């Protein structure tokens, strides 16, 4: 169902610096103690990364343009930002892959989804349990189907600095959505922290879909509330 909350506060677009991030293994080739040049889509050092800070009033998930490839980060201690849509017009006619984790397993399923303007997970704030999902209702003319390997996830509220930091890279390239992954522990309130971290591939998804826009999917803590958890979006350039 297309349930939108009433008070939707606009993002202030607090820019941050992609200090030493967005570096991934460019190919499946082991190289030992060498210097190697690469012409590929990378995140440039010290680029403008649009922050998205979620507070009790601010609910950050705009329809962000994809533009040849994105970097993604998410400062987490409650693992809130679990979910990615990659659509053309974010409506029913266009093709949209939906990469989501429903806290037991990651499910990738591309179809012609009637995208709601406000996807959310009805999770209680003191309890911290996923009750339902209302992301998709109709799925006609479905292309792609995938279910990954299972792993546990914690949902409930914490308070303080961030323990987790999921760092993702999405490249649309000949219809193959290359997805990368890295992780390191941090300690920060709102800034995308400076530091070097290398990302590793997980999915070469044979989609073949027009990806021009995207939107993350948030875990609301239910009249709504969100815990302190920010995410970051950069752009990849050749």
């Amino acid at each position: 169902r297309c349930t939108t909350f009433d008070d939707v506060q606009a993002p202030n677009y607090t820019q941050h610096t992609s200090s030493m991030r967005g570096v991934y293994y460019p190919d499946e080739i082991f190289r030992s103690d060498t210097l190697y040049l690469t012409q590929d889509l990378f995140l440039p050092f010290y680029s403008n990364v649009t922050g998205f800070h979620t507070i009790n009033h601010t609910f950050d998930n705009p329809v962000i343009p994809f533009k040849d490839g994105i970097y993604f980060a998410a400062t987490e201690k409650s693992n809130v930002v679990r979910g990615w849509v990659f659509g053309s017009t974010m409506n029913n006619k266009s093709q949209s892959v939906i990469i989501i984790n429903n806290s037991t397993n990651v499910v990738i399923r591309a179809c012609n989804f009637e995208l709601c303007d406000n996807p959310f997970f009805a999770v209680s704030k003191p309890m911290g349990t996923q009750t339902h999902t209302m992301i998709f209702d109709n799925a006609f003319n479905c292309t792609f189907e995938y279910i990954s390997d299972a792993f546990s996830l914690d949902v409930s509220e914490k308070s303080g600095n961030f323990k987790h930091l999921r760092e993702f890279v999405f490249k649309n390239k000949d219809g193959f959505l290359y997805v990368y992954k890295g992780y390191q522990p941090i300690d920060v309130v709102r800034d995308l922290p400076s530091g070097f971290n290398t990302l590793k591939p997980i999915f070469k998804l044979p989609l073949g879909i027009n990806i021009t826009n995207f939107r993350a999917i948030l875990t609301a803590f239910s009249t709504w509330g969100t815990s302190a958890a920010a995410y970051f979006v950069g752009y990849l350039k050749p």
Partner: protein, 197 residues
């Protein structure tokens, strides 16, 4: 090609065959369509299933208004037509040169690996030759070819046993030959192998 684009970079096999008997019905075959108008072009291995009502300017439409066309074509067939208008079922076999753990074999029986120098090793996509030798190289599990300074594959993780081994080539070099005077003596020219003995 404006509907299905195959790139110059990545490439596979294109397979077409005639279906005058099956698809080319004598009365018509209007199950198959294709777009003939679209804003811009399509990227390779990328398509648009959606039946968006086309306009040349970019405004949304409702047909049959001025310059509001449907993108799809009434693309019929008849068995009485010529060979140039017959339907052809085309299967495009794109491959992966991106050497992940392999799927297709094209089956040969797989022998046992040996530490012996000079083996014609044929791994998944490496028809090289050389010296299989086990190595202490680390290999994060999403990479399985090792290269050292250049083009040549230095080390491979074995596809059966996941054993990490580096490849040395067949121990080549130049042969040099000492001779004294052939008028002095035709006695044995002693040699060089620029190799471990």
């Amino acid at each position: 090609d404006y509907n299905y684009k195959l790139p110059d970079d990545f490439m596979g096999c294109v397979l077409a065959w005639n279906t005058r008997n099956i698809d080319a019905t004598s009365t018509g075959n209007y199950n198959y369509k294709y777009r003939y108008l679209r804003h811009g072009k399509l990227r390779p291995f990328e398509r648009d299933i959606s039946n968006v009502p086309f306009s040349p300017d970019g405004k949304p439409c409702t047909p049959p208004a001025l310059n509001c066309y449907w993108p799809l074509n009434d693309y019929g067939f008849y068995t009485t037509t010529g060979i140039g208008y017959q339907p052809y079922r085309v299967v495009v076999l794109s491959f992966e040169l991106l050497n992940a753990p392999a799927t297709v074999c094209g089956p040969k029986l797989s022998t046992d690996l040996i530490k012996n120098q000079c083996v014609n090793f044929n791994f998944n996509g490496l028809t090289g030759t050389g010296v299989l030798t086990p190595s202490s190289k680390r290999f994060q599990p999403f990479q399985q070819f090792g290269r050292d300074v250049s083009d040549f594959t230095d080390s491979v993780r074995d596809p059966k046993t996941s054993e990490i081994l580096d490849i040395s080539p067949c121990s080549f070099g130049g042969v040099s030959v000492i001779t004294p005077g052939t008028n002095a003596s035709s006695e044995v020219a002693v040699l060089y192998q620029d190799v471990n003995c």
